[PDB]
Ligand binder design. Structure first.
Ligand SMILES: Nc1ncnc2c1ncn2[C@@H]1O[C@H](C[C@@H](N)CC[C@H](N)C(=O)O)[C@@H](O)[C@H]1O
Length: 254
DNA sequence: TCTAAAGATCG
DNA sequence: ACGATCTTTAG
């Protein structure tokens, strides 16, 4: 069991056993919504193609892969007792938003992920990061996790683009896993129109003998979008009050 | 998930 | 120059 080095929304570490039970075998794995990378880090394919719409995240992954020793030594200097203070936090956030150097922006990005409020990621319409101070007791510097990420990445390529464009890179030796933002539980972001279009693209790939696996909440809407697949219920019963389970859908060819 | 200030849109 | 009703911002 291997851990990511970033805090992130909708991370899949606790569901890995159920995912690996139903995921097919092949030469190359494609992830159109990669995020913090928990599945990439806990599987064994010989090639990977990894993509996301967030451009600060993709640039950080390129620096860590190609300039490893230089990156670690510089980032370690920001994790000391002197920097756990509100007046210092708001000046570093300001330096980040004004800089135009990829290496310096990547160093500061990790500090903000581990000292900021509840570990969030949020921006305004101008592209400035605006999460406030978090006040933790003693944050942890993920050194071991950073070296292991660099090592596995020697066999992957990274891209900044949307889900229709990355899914079109697949060929007759590939396998695809999708993890989109969650569907709503009651009546800008990922739209209803977009949730349905994703299911349509999957039905077209499976005609070409290319297999696909998807995950989301178990509701009335998701059962309708994914009607042409085989469905498996995962009991979780998380409160809020009511219980909700999770769902997996598998498209397999003949 | 929350809320007091500031800016956007139409007749 | 006016006012009712929405969006947007950031602790
Ligand atoms: N149109 C889009 N195309 C591609 N990625 C998107 C799009 N919209 C949102 N995303 C990303 O989808 C990701 C959703 C995450 N929940 C995935 C978590 C990931 N499985 C992990 O283990 O960390 C986010 O990182 C988004 O930035």
């Amino acid at each position: 069991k291997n851990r990511a080095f970033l805090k992130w929304a909708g991370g899949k570490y606790p569901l890995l056993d159920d995912i690996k039970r139903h995921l097919p075998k092949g030469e190359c794995l494609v992830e159109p919504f990669v995020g913090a990378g928990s599945v990439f880090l806990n599987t064994d394919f010989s090639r990977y193609i990894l993509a996301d719409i967030n451009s600060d995240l993709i640039s950080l992954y390129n620096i860590v892969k190609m300039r490893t020793d230089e990156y670690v030594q510089a980032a370690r200097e920001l994790f000391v007792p002197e920097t756990n203070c509100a007046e210092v936090y708001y000046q570093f956030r300001e330096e980040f938003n004004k800089s135009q150097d990829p290496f310096r922006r990547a160093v500061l990005f990790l500090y903000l992920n581990r000292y900021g409020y509840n570990g969030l990621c949020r921006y305004n319409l101008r592209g400035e990061f605006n999460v406030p101070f978090g006040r933790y007791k003693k944050p942890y510097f993920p050194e071991a996790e950073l070296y292991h990420f660099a090592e596995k990445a020697q066999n992957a390529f990274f891209y900044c683009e949307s889900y229709a464009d990355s899914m079109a890179r697949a060929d007759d030796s590939s396998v695809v896993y999708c993890d989109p933002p969650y569907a709503p539980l009651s009546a800008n972001s990922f739209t209803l129109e977009q949730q349905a279009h994703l299911a349509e693209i999957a039905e077209g790939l499976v005609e070409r003998h290319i297999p696909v696996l998807i995950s989301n909440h178990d509701t009335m809407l998701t059962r309708e979008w994914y009607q042409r697949a085989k469905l498996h219920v995962v009991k979780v019963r998380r409160s809020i009050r009511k219980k909700v389970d999770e769902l997996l859908a598998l498209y397999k060819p003949g």
